[PDB]
Design a protein around this ligand. Structure first.
Ligand SMILES: CCS(=O)(=O)Nc1cc(-c2cc(NC)c(=O)n(C)c2)cc2c1ccn2C(C)(c1ccccn1)c1ccccn1
Length: 127
């Protein structure tokens, strides 16, 4: 069994800018989730070889994880907040689609998502 390559995190030719909303997403949002005791399964791509999940990367179209989101924010991959918020939502929804309600990994995702929703409720207005 193989894992696919991770999501793209570096592209020197991409359109890029640095903005207050993206700074908040790294310094407040990602930082808050990252230090949480339930973060660790989300801090790197799902390793389907390690977990013996030969279907994961046949049924999940757009894998995402916080290690990738952290690198994307660090490399100014995201033009705007909506793109980064979408990556966090993809990460959560992948987890909820692949797993069953009340599974440990789902409880962990739900705790992280509650903190996420609270922090992006106060996403600053774009300057
Ligand atoms: C750092 C990325 S890793 O891959 O190296 N490590 C892990 C990622 C995910 C995991 C699985 C998902 N679904 C299958 C998923 O959706 N996510 C987001 C993460 C789950 C992982 C691990 C390492 C161990 N587990 C288990 C044992 C687990 C849960 C469900 C299915 C298979 N194994 C686990 C159980 C309970 C609590 C936490 N962890």
């Amino acid at each position: 069994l193989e894992n696919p390559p991770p999501p793209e995190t570096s592209n020197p030719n991409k359109p890029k800018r640095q903005t207050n909303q993206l700074q908040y997403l790294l310094r407040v949002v990602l930082k808050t989730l990252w230090k949480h005791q339930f973060a660790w399964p989300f801090q790197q791509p799902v390793d389907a070889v390690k977990l013996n999940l030969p279907d994961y990367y046949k049924i999940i179209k757009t894998p995402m994880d916080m290690g990738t989101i952290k690198k994307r924010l660090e490399n100014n991959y995201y033009w705007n907040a909506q793109e980064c918020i979408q990556d966090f939502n993809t990460m959560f929804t992948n987890c909820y689609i692949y797993n069953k309600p009340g599974d440990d990994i789902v409880l962990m995702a739900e705790a992280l998502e509650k903190l996420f929703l609270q922090k992006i409720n106060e996403l600053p207005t774009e300057e």
